[PDB]
Amino acid sequence: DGPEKNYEKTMAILQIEAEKAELRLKELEVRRLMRARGDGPWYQYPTIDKALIDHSPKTTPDN
Amino acid sequence: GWVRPDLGELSKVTKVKTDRPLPENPYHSRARPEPNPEAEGDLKPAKHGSRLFFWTM
């Protein structure tokens, strides 16, 4: 087939791998700062749930 | 003019009309932390598949 086969095929392949390359680098730093800061959708380590706490009046007044 | 309260009468829960205001912060709680960014938005197929090494899809 003509060179427009390989020319446009390379255009598609090179572009697609280019987006993957930048996304891979973006993922490395996004995970890096998300793990450090923790203010992100993931890497949220579990903590104690606040619905377990009982608020009813106890024996001693001051608690 | 005193009558001995019957059994369990002294153990009832009573109501009073104290005119002091309700303490807004009885525990003197500090400012509550801001919630983490809420998880929302629509889900679309992962861009360029797994994006891990030679796995195109």
UniProtKB/TrEMBL annotation, chain A:
<feature type="coiled-coil region">
    <location>
        <begin position="4"/>
        <end position="36"/>
    </location>
</feature>
<protein>
    <recommendedName>
        <fullName>NADH dehydrogenase [ubiquinone] 1 beta subcomplex subunit 5, mitochondrial</fullName>
    </recommendedName>
</protein>
<comment type="function">
    <text>Accessory subunit of the mitochondrial membrane respiratory chain NADH dehydrogenase (Complex I), that is believed not to be involved in catalysis. Complex I functions in the transfer of electrons from NADH to the respiratory chain. The immediate electron acceptor for the enzyme is believed to be ubiquinone.</text>
</comment>
<comment type="similarity">
    <text>Belongs to the complex I NDUFB5 subunit family.</text>
</comment>
<comment type="subunit">
    <text>Complex I is composed of 45 different subunits.</text>
</comment>
TrEMBL record, chain B:
<feature type="region of interest" description="Disordered">
    <location>
        <begin position="18"/>
        <end position="49"/>
    </location>
</feature>
<protein>
    <recommendedName>
        <fullName>NADH dehydrogenase [ubiquinone] 1 alpha subcomplex subunit 8</fullName>
    </recommendedName>
</protein>
<comment type="subunit">
    <text>Complex I is composed of 45 different subunits.</text>
</comment>
<comment type="function">
    <text>Accessory subunit of the mitochondrial membrane respiratory chain NADH dehydrogenase (Complex I), that is believed not to be involved in catalysis. Complex I functions in the transfer of electrons from NADH to the respiratory chain. The immediate electron acceptor for the enzyme is believed to be ubiquinone.</text>
</comment>
<feature type="compositionally biased region" description="Basic and acidic residues">
    <location>
        <begin position="31"/>
        <end position="45"/>
    </location>
</feature>
<comment type="similarity">
    <text>Belongs to the complex I NDUFA8 subunit family.</text>
</comment>
